[PDB]
Amino acid sequence: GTTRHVYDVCDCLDTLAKLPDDSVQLIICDPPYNIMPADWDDHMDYIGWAKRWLAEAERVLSPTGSIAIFGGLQYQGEAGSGDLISIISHMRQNSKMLLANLIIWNYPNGMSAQRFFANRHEEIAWFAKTKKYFFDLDAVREPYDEETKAAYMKDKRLNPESVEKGRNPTNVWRMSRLNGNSLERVGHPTQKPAAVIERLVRALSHPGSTVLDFFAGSGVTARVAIQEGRNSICTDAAPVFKEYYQKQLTFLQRSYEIVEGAANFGAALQRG
Ligand SMILES: [Cl-]
Ligand SMILES: [Cl-]
Numbered sequence: 001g002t003t004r005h006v007y008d009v010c011d012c013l014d015t016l017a018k019l020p021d022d023s024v025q026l027i028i029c030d031p032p033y034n035i036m037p038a039d040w041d042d043h044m045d046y047i048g049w050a051k052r053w054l055a056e057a058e059r060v061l062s063p064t065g066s067i068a069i070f071g072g073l074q075y076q077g078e079a080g081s082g083d084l085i086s087i088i089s090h091m092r093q094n095s096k097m098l099l100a101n102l103i104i105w106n107y108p109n110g111m112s113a114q115r116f117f118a119n120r121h122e123e124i125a126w127f128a129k130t131k132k133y134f135f136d137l138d139a140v141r142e143p144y145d146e147e148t149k150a151a152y153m154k155d156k157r158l159n160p161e162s163v164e165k166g167r168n169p170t171n172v173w174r175m176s177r178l179n180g181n182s183l184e185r186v187g188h189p190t191q192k193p194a195a196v197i198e199r200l201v202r203a204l205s206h207p208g209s210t211v212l213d214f215f216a217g218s219g220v221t222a223r224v225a226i227q228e229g230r231n232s233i234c235t236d237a238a239p240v241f242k243e244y245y246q247k248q249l250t251f252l253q254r255s256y257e258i259v260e261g262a263a264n265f266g267a268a269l270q271r272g
Contacts, residue, residue: 001208003231003256004268005222007245010235012214016056018262023269024060024233025134025209026201027067028221030192034081046082047090053214054090058097060212064134066100066204069125070192084123097127105196107177124196126204134209139202141166173199186247187240188218197224205230210268219245226256231268 008015035049043049057067071084091097103124110120143166144152152163178184178193185191197220205211207229213221216234222245225232234245242260249258259267 001229001255001272003208003226003229004259004270005226005232005234005256006259006261006264006268007216007219007222007234007241008260008262009237009239009241010214010262011237012053012235013056015214015233015235015262015265016053016060018265019060019212019233020269021059022062022065023210024212025062025065026205026211026230027057027061027065028197028200028211028213029057029067029215030070030190030217031215033071033075033083034078040080043080046080047086050082050087051090051094054087054095058095058129061129063130064132066126066128066133067097068200068204069127070105070122071125072122074119084125088125091127095127097129098131098133099125100128100133101126101171104172106172106174108174109177124200126200134204134206136203136206137168138165140169140199142169169199183251184220186218186244186251188244191218192220194220194224197221198228201225201228201230208272216241217244219248223248223252226252231270233265233268235262 031050033046035043035046039049061067069084069087071087073083073085075081075083075086088099103126105122105124107120110118112118144163149163152158153160173196175193175195178191184194201211201224209230211221211225211230211232213234216236219234219241222232222234
């Protein structure tokens with residue numbers, strides 16, 4: 001089949017307001033963790049600002065849909081800022097969504113530290129709209145080296161089926177952060193590695209379904225959606241997004257259609 005991808009520079013709420021209820025299958029959410037100076041006109045803290053798109057994110061997700069929210073757990077208390085805990089706490093008090101998993105993204109390198117343990121992790125809260133959420137475990141199982149599985153097939157106590165399928169990747173993923181010399185680089189400083197996004201897309205969304213990202217940043221979600229046979233809608237408030245997004249396409253240089261303009265969101269919503 002052929003997938004559709006719509007993109008545009010927009011404010012998250014403005015994007016969400018144009019999407020119908022239960023219209024998207026998966027949402028990739030890597031939000032800012034501090035509000036803007038202007039936001040201080042209508043809010044007194046981070047969650048006050050974030051609860052708006054959080055509620056909307058839930059509305060646009062279908063019954064089988066899910067949202068993956070990246071965030072840290074070491075927020076220090078500055079006004080107007082917060083972290084993944086601030087979001088989870090809020091969700092526990094005001095949302096009916098289920099916390100399916102708290103995934104730990106454990107990366108190999110980082111800065112050193114003398115007065116504490118060097119930070120080597122970031123979290124991913126996977127919230128499912130309902131208990132009927134979609135989940136393709138097989139699509140993300142990790143294979144066993146030709147020998148290790150040969151030994152498991154000898155062990156009659158183990159289920160042959162499970163052996164060939166592969167292992168559950170667990171809720172701790174050891175994946176390398178995107179390095180400065182990596183070809184994936186589009187210029188976005190906090191660009192997430194395609195590997196993490198891929199795993200989320202393959203396990204939490206089905207082929208041909210729609211993936212949404214209103215904090216698209218580098219547009220990695222669109223690149224991964226295209227590669228995995230999913231439709232997508234990516235918007236970012238920064239005008240530089242267009243440039244990144246195009247750069248993101250030059251890498252792709254198995255048929256898809258790219259469509260610019262919020263007025264065309266519908267193209268990526270059609271189930272096909
Ligand atoms: Cl790393
Ligand atoms: Cl990104």
